Amino acid sequence: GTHSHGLFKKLGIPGPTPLPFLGNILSYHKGFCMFDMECHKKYGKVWGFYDGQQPVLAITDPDMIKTVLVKECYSVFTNRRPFGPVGFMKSAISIAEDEEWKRLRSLLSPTFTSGKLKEMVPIIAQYGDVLVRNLRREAETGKPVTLKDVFGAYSMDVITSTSFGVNIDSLNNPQDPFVENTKKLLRFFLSITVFPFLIPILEVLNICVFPREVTNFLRKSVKRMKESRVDFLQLMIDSQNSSHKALSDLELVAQSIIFIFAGYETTSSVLSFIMYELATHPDVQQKLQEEIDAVLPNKAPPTYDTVLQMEYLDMVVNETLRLFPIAMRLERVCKKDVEINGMFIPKGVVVMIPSYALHRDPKYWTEPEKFLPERFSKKNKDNIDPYIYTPFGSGPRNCIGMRFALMNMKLALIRVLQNFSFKPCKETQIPLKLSLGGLLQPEKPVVLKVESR
Amino acid sequence: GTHSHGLFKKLGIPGPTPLPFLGNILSYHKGFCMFDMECHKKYGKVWGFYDGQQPVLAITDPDMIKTVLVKECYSVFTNRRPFGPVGFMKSAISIAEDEEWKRLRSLLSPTFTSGKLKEMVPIIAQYGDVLVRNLRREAETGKPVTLKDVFGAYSMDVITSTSFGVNIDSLNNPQDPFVENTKKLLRFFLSITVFPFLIPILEVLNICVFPREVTNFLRKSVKRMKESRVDFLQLMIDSQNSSHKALSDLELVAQSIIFIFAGYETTSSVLSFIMYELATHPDVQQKLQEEIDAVLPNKAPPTYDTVLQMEYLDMVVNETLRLFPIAMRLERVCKKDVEINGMFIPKGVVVMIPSYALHRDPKYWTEPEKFLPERFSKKNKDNIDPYIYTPFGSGPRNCIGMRFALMNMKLALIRVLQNFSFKPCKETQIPLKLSLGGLLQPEKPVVLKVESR
Ligand code: HEM
Numbered sequence: 001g002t003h004s005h006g007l008f009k010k011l012g013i014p015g016p017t018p019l020p021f022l023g024n025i026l027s028y029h030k031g032f033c034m035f036d037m038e039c040h041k042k043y044g045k046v047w048g049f050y051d052g053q054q055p056v057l058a059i060t061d062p063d064m065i066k067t068v069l070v071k072e073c074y075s076v077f078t079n080r081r082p083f084g085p086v087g088f089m090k091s092a093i094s095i096a097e098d099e100e101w102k103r104l105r106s107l108l109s110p111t112f113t114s115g116k117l118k119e120m121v122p123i124i125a126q127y128g129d130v131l132v133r134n135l136r137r138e139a140e141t142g143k144p145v146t147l148k149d150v151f152g153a154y155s156m157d158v159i160t161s162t163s164f165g166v167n168i169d170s171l172n173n174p175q176d177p178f179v180e181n182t183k184k185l186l187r188f189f190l191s192i193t194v195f196p197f198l199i200p201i202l203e204v205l206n207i208c209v210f211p212r213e214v215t216n217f218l219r220k221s222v223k224r225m226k227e228s229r230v231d232f233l234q235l236m237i238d239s240q241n242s243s244h245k246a247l248s249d250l251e252l253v254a255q256s257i258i259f260i261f262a263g264y265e266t267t268s269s270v271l272s273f274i275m276y277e278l279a280t281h282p283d284v285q286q287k288l289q290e291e292i293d294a295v296l297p298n299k300a301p302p303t304y305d306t307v308l309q310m311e312y313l314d315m316v317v318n319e320t321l322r323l324f325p326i327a328m329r330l331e332r333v334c335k336k337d338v339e340i341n342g343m344f345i346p347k348g349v350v351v352m353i354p355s356y357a358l359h360r361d362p363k364y365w366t367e368p369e370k371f372l373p374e375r376f377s378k379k380n381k382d383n384i385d386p387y388i389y390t391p392f393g394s395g396p397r398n399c400i401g402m403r404f405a406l407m408n409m410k411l412a413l414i415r416v417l418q419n420f421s422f423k424p425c426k427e428t429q430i431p432l433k434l435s436l437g438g439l440l441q442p443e444k445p446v447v448l449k450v451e452s453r
Numbered sequence: 454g455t456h457s458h459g460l461f462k463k464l465g466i467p468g469p470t471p472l473p474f475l476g477n478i479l480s481y482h483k484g485f486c487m488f489d490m491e492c493h494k495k496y497g498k499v500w501g502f503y504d505g506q507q508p509v510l511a512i513t514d515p516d517m518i519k520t521v522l523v524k525e526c527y528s529v530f531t532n533r534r535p536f537g538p539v540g541f542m543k544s545a546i547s548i549a550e551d552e553e554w555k556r557l558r559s560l561l562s563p564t565f566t567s568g569k570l571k572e573m574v575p576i577i578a579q580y581g582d583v584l585v586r587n588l589r590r591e592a593e594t595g596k597p598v599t600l601k602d603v604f605g606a607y608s609m610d611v612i613t614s615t616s617f618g619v620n621i622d623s624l625n626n627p628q629d630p631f632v633e634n635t636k637k638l639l640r641f642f643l644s645i646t647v648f649p650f651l652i653p654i655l656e657v658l659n660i661c662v663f664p665r666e667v668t669n670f671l672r673k674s675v676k677r678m679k680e681s682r683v684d685f686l687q688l689m690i691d692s693q694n695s696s697h698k699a700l701s702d703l704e705l706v707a708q709s710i711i712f713i714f715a716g717y718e719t720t721s722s723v724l725s726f727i728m729y730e731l732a733t734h735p736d737v738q739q740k741l742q743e744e745i746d747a748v749l750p751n752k753a754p755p756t757y758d759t760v761l762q763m764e765y766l767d768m769v770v771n772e773t774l775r776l777f778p779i780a781m782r783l784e785r786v787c788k789k790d791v792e793i794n795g796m797f798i799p800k801g802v803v804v805m806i807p808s809y810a811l812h813r814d815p816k817y818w819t820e821p822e823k824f825l826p827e828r829f830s831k832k833n834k835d836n837i838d839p840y841i842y843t844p845f846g847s848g849p850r851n852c853i854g855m856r857f858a859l860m861n862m863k864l865a866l867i868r869v870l871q872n873f874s875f876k877p878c879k880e881t882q883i884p885l886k887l888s889l890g891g892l893l894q895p896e897k898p899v900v901l902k903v904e905s906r
């Protein structure tokens with residue numbers, strides 16, 4: 001089981017010696033992030049390891065990262081590593097490959113523009129009101145608040161409503177049909193990465209890592225609203241009634257599902273990360289709350305243009321994403337033999353960009369382990385390399401919902417800080433530790449005290 | 454197990470209704486050829502069926518065949534369907550895909566030219582002398598001759614000698630090390646086509662459909678002759694010491710092995726097919742023997758330029774290949790969604806050209822089941838469509854050893870007909886029947902009487 005296990009030794013590329021069949025997966029016992037920082041420290045700018053028999057080439061040179069993510073995206077590095085068994089979710093944009101992804105990116109792009117986001121803000125604002133009343137409830141109880149529930153309820157509230165046009169107080173309504181389905185769906189893989197040779201077997205088995213009932217539920221659910229108002233689902237329906245063939249009925253369901261996966265636990269974790277940093281830095285929480293009340297006096301409701309007016313809110317969000325890039329890694333499959341910036345890359349290799357390691361690299365960040373929003377001040381922001389700081393990826397296949405995610409979090413933070421201050425309690429994990437999973441998340445959930453202003 | 458089994462029903466393309474998981478493979482019980490002729494008769498110009506869950510789209514329009522084989526070869530239809538587990542034989546030109554095949558086709562092309570073939574004829578001639586003395590031995594015994602042994606011994610003689618630079622009277626020397634290895638190698642697949650989802654499993658199993666000892670044998674065997682004369686092996690070594698990277702040591706072994714597979718049973722079967730047609734048509738055998746003795750009086754030895762002088766020999770060979778195209782089918786994988794000659798072809802579909810069916814189509818061939826070499830006379834040959842008659846494929850990925858194969862067979866036929874006449878005996882399968890396997894071969898071996906002129 002050492003096929004390809006001599007690839008990096010042949011290329012002269014350093015890296016940890018793999019074991020037969022397993023590759024270097026045993027080193028993942030301390031997590032992706034610790035493994036990336038160690039390899040970066042041990043082997044320098046480039047190194048290779050094996051997910052089972054799959055060679056993975058890590059790169060850290062920003063010139064080389066730009067070549068992979070931007071310049072050679074369409075011709076060489078178009079796709080992420082295969083993920084399955086997907087079934088009909090093969091039509092999702094994040095799973096699609098080559099021309100099929102290229103077409104999906106074109107049809108969905110006008111839906112994620114600045115203009116469309118401003119027309120969705122009044123919807124996001126309503127769920128912000130739900131977040132505040134769900135928070136002040138647990139605030140009544142002096143007993144501390146585990147944020148992942150009230151924030152996860154908010155994160156799922158917005159993302160499924162926008163993606164499917166429904167309305168739910170998901171916390172106070174565990175009964176709505178569009179809730180229980182989305183709940184078991186968002187509960188989420190191993191040997192599919194270590195042993196990806198089984199995926200074709202798993203596919204023909206009719207196996208779907210997505211539950212079979214939820215997918216059949218959402219399909220008939222979207223067909224319900226065909227018989228008919230500014231949401232992801234609605235903006236995609238308008239794209240059908242328009243070059244590329246329009247989004248099919250099944251493709252449309254695939255995109256709405258993939259938006260919930262890319263948006264639920266991602267937003268919920270960053271919101272818990274942000275509030276942990278604001279609780280352990282009262283001055284930053286004070287300076288932020290003072291900015292919100294200046295832009296929005298008398299607890300004025302937030303709007304699209306006022307959110308972009310809050311520079312310190314943008315600095316706090318960006319600095320949290322540097323410390324906690326929940327994707328941890330960016331990956332591209334080398335579709336054909338190429339040489340970039342004076343280095344040969346063999347066809348089939350997975351090229352990985354260790355975002356977590358690069359975000360905490362002392363060579364680019366003074367005291368990289370400290371939460372310091374002034375790194376993103378208008379003075380100091382010009383020194384940050386866009387290919388070192390990559391919380392939303394980069395190039396033509398970056399996070400297409402990036403603008404929305406930032407708006408959605410900022411809108412939640414404004415509505416929460418306008419009403420509450422946040423302090424740590426005796427059970428808050430200080431220092432916070434990271435869980436060893438496929439998304440960067442706090443090891444133990446963030447528990448904080450929530451006082452009412 | 455009906456994924457993709459609704460593809461042709463959706464496209465409106467006719468074809469036999471598949472069974473779950475199996476597809477249409479049960480219809481293969483009477484062979485590829487009978488199944489292709491029936492579908493052609495039943496459904497007309499185009500139809501689709503399923504090798505398991507693999508959609509196969511059959512086309513018969515010569516304009517559309519030209520588009521697939523020639524015009525859209527490099528951009529859409531570059532590859533045959535996957536074949537494995539191959540191991541290091543992935544570097545063989547017939548197995549290689551996309552740019553890797555494109556490079557191999559360039560490096561090997563100058564080796565299969567008209568000029569190089571003329572320099573190999575003196576080597577092929579020697580094994581022709583071995584064929585005659587091996588034939589006159591069984592001719593001494595009035596007992597009939599099973600041709601597949603004396604011809605198979607000749608076919609393996611030439612193809613392995615040219616591909617590896619050795620010399621063997623393989624019939625009279627079952628002791629030479631380069632014989633027993635080539636023998637067990639040439640003895641040769643099922644669910645790899647019906648259930649190709651297992652190939653990745655079989656690969657990581659370290660399974661090699663090629664025996665593990667023979668491959669390790671030939672590698673050290675080629676390295677023996679590195680320490681050093683007009684053969685395939687020698688012409689490839691000269692290509693290394695020369696744009697594309699040169700043939701590696703392992704790639705060179707892969708090509709020499711793939712030449713033996715493409716050349717042994719193919720040549721041996723056509724030679725048995727040809728001699729069956731000459732035995733059951735004494736006038737054609739007479740007219741051919743009269744041509745050989747006019748071009749080559751006094752049983753003169755054949756040369757390169759005299760072989761191309763024998764038009765009737767070329768007509769007999771070509772007419773045998775129409776009746777018996779041992780590949781039976783040409784196949785290309787549609788690498789991306791395309792429309793050709795007003796018909797949509799989905800990505801991933803296997804496009805198949807039913808050569809056997811087209812060669813016996815009454816719409817192009819008057820009495821297509823009769824052996825009639827005059828179809829290829831200088832008068833009548835202009836009416837034959839090169840995309841209907843495709844015994845060696847067509848386009849940039851056709852049989853690269855085509856010129857050699859025709860020369861090798863013609864040289865054997867000249868040397869055999871100069872000495873012997875061939876008549877059927879009471880055990881000759883008349884009418885000959887075809888075996889139901891992956892290569893077109895006589896059901897029962899051809900047994901004939903061999904008189905000495
Ligand atoms: C804090 C929130 C989020 C973070 C940190 C995040 C991060 C990322 C990252 C790193 C990628 C891969 C980029 C690359 O490989 O270059 C990605 C892809 C993607 N994200 Fe986000 N994401 C967030 C929220 C969202 C939301 C709310 C949506 C809503 C639609 C979304 C939709 C997508 C999609 C569709 C892709 C795949 C794009 C493609 O393959 O073309 N994400 N995300």
Ligand code: HEM
Pocket residue numbers: 546547548558711712713715716717719720723779780783784843844845846847848849850851852853854855857858
């Ligand atoms: C009567 C003898 C032969 C017949 C009928 C025959 C037939 C064929 C056919 C139909 C193909 C596929 C063409 C296509 O898909 O368009 C092929 C491919 C090939 N043949 Fe032959 N063949 C014969 C002898 C030989 C010999 C003696 C060699 C010696 C090297 C050879 C080497 C090859 C190779 C390397 C390929 C693969 C070409 C590629 O994939 O680029 N063949 N053959």
Ligand SMILES: NC(=O)C(c1ccccc1)(c1ccccc1)[C@@H]1CCN(CCc2ccc3c(c2)CCO3)C1
Pocket residue numbers: 080081083093094095096258261262266326327438439
């Ligand atoms: N299509 C894909 O490969 C996925 C994807 C990966 C990175 C960015 C976007 C999308 C995906 C599959 C299915 C559902 C959601 C996401 C991969 C396949 C396995 N990995 C597991 C979980 C995951 C990892 C990173 C991450 C996200 C999810 C969202 C943004 O980053 C997600």
Ligand SMILES: NC(=O)C(c1ccccc1)(c1ccccc1)[C@@H]1CCN(CCc2ccc3c(c2)CCO3)C1
Pocket residue numbers: 533534536546547548549711714715719779780891892
């Ligand atoms: N590379 C390939 O796909 C092969 C190939 C197929 C058609 C033309 C050329 C090559 C091959 C694989 C391994 C060894 C020899 C040939 C295929 C894979 C399975 N099929 C089985 C036997 C076979 C079928 C048709 C035929 C030949 C061999 C030689 C010319 O036609 C051969």
